[PDB]
């Protein structure tokens, strides 16, 4: 469960991103192709070359459903229940690709918020994105 | 492989006994109901709605003995897992998009299906070495992905 | 989240267990011991050989928890409060571990309940071994 | 360990601007606040109650720079992990009794350390290269684990 503590954490860190969301969502995608590999299995029907816009298009909305839960952090599985019916009934994606894309997004912080990318915050953002993968996984059986 | 000779006598031996017909049908779709996602690559294949449907699908049964039947010749190359499967992977990343992943739920149900199978037979030393082969198989199966 | 078709089909399979539970609890740790060696790493203290008292007495242990979750499966974290608690505070087995268990319980329960391991069985059994496995690692951080 | 020669100036390139007293503290204080049940084997280094405390902590600092300096020995012999791995691998298993798990941990954390540090300068690419690195040591701290 995430703490107060790991709450502001996560909504002051996320609040720095802003206006790059999109930008680092579609960055976390693509690191996530050339580390894991296997993940580009989900996008067959993607263009996956560096600068596609289908990559540019699909970080923004995976970026803009993490700035919901951040902005309905009190009650992810409500938010985020659409997201999760999507994923459990069409997308199908294996469980174990979320940790995945948490891992890639945690190193794009990383790399653009080196101040605020702090052990706390760090602790915080990995707690977070482990929560927004479990919901989203919740009704896959 | 790094079998022990013991290790490759005893997979080898059990495997002997193995109806790969009945196996390789049961693993599938026991994948299919455990793994409810995994149904993704299948929706050609019918009503995949119960467990009973999956279990009865005889596209289901008949892709799990053509799956168990390319495994079945694997074991004949312990020693050389990635060269036996580099076409089979390629194929699965390359034209199937399947998640390397899978490979490994495929496994772990395996050995699921011979210890339902064997009973008695399938000991804590028997299962460790078919733990090793299936690791083995989902990453020459996984080997060629890029 | 265990349906109530899981839950009878739990209450089944573990039913048909009985007297054995502890039998079936060593067996399993023997199982993951052999084919998951890191997991040895946290049994120091133990005589990990074949027929070990250490290990069977342990076996017991597990499976006696095993139960008190099929009995308590509506209530489950509060039914392993303490032993969430254990294991995140004192314990502290990384979470990999749990799937372990768990892969090496359903692989004892197949050889041991022919009839009962039924597809939807093996299917709820599964389910159930993971809704324990995040109960008890629920407090880890 | 499929590291192209492209991967391998990479990771030499990269690795030739960090600080391992730093990035070794750096990354052993992050594994122990963000995994804190990792915090086990080091019940001997005093408080570890907070962020602060971890972080800061001589002990852990002092362990993260031994830890990072067997690293980069292991870079230098990205040939033979395995061979240039195996005393500690032993004694990991053996003696420290290690979760061969948090060598996994570690890598990761120790990648977010590296974006951490270069910024933009640890590009996609660079990533994917240093990912089937921390992978491969971590495979070389595992391979003797019986
Ligand atoms: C925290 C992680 C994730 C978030 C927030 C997320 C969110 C989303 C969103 C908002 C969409 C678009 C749905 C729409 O059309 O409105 C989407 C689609 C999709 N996601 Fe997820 N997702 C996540 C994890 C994953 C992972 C790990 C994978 C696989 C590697 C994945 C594969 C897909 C695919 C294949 C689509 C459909 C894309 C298309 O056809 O345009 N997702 N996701
Ligand atoms: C033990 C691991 C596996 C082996 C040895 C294996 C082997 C095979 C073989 C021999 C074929 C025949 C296709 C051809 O030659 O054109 C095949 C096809 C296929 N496999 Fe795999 N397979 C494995 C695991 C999986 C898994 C786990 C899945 C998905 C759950 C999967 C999905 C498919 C699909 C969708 C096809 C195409 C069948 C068709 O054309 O309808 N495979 N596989
Ligand atoms: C299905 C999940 C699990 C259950 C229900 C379970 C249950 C238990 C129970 C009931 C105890 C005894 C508490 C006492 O002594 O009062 C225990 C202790 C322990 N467990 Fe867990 N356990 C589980 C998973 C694991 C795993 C996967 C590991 C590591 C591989 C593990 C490691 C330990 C250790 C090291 C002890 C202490 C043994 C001793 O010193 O006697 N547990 N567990
Ligand atoms: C890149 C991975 C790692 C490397 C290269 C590495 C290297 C080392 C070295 C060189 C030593 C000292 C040898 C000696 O005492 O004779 C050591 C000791 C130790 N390592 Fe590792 N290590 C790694 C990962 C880890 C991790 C992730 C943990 C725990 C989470 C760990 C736990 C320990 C412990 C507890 C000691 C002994 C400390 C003491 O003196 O009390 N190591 N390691």
Chains 1, 3 share one sequence.
């Not at chain 1, 469960?1 to 860190?13: E, F, G, I, Q, Y």
């Not at chain 2, 017909?21 to 993704?40: C, I, S």
């Not at chain 2, 119960?50 to 003995?65: F, R, S």
């Not at chain 2, 037979?121 to 070495?129: L, Y």
Request: with cysteine; aromatic share 8%.
């Amino acid at each position: 469960v995430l703490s107060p503590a790991d709450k502001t954490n996560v909504k002051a860190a996320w609040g720095k991103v802003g206006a790059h969301a999109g930008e680092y969502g579609a960055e976390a995608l693509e690191r996530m192709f050339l580390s894991f590999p296997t993940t580009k299995t989900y996008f067959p029907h993607f263009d996956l070359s560096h600068g596609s816009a289908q990559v540019k298009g699909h970080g923004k909305k995976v970026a803009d459903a993490l700035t919901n839960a951040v902005a309905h952090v009190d009650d992810m599985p409500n938010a985020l229940s659409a997201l999760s019916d999507l994923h459990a009934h069409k997308l199908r994606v294996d469980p174990v690709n979320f940790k995945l894309l948490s891992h890639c997004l945690l190193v794009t912080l990383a790399a653009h918020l080196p101040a605020e990318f702090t052990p706390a915050v760090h602790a915080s953002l990995d707690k977070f994105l482990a929560s927004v993968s479990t919901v989203l996984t919740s009704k896959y059986r | 492989m790094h079998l022990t000779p013991e290790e490759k006598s005893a997979v080898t031996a059990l495997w002997g006994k193995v109806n790969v017909d009945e196996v390789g049908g049961e693993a599938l779709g026991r994948l299919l109901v455990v793994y409810p996602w995994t149904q993704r690559f299948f929706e050609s294949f019918g009503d995949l709605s119960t467990p009973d449907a999956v279990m009865g699908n005889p596209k289901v049964k008949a892709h799990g003995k053509k799956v168990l039947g390319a495994f079945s010749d694997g074991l004949a190359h312990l020693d050389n897992l990635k060269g036996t499967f580099a076409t089979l992977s390629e194929l699965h990343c390359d034209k199937l998009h399947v998640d390397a992943e899978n490979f490994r739920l495929l496994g772990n149900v395996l050995v699921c299906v011979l210890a339902h199978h064997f009973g008695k037979e399938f000991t804590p030393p028997v299962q460790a070495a078919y733990q090793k082969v299936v690791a083995g198989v989902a990453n020459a199966l996984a080997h060629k992905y890029h």
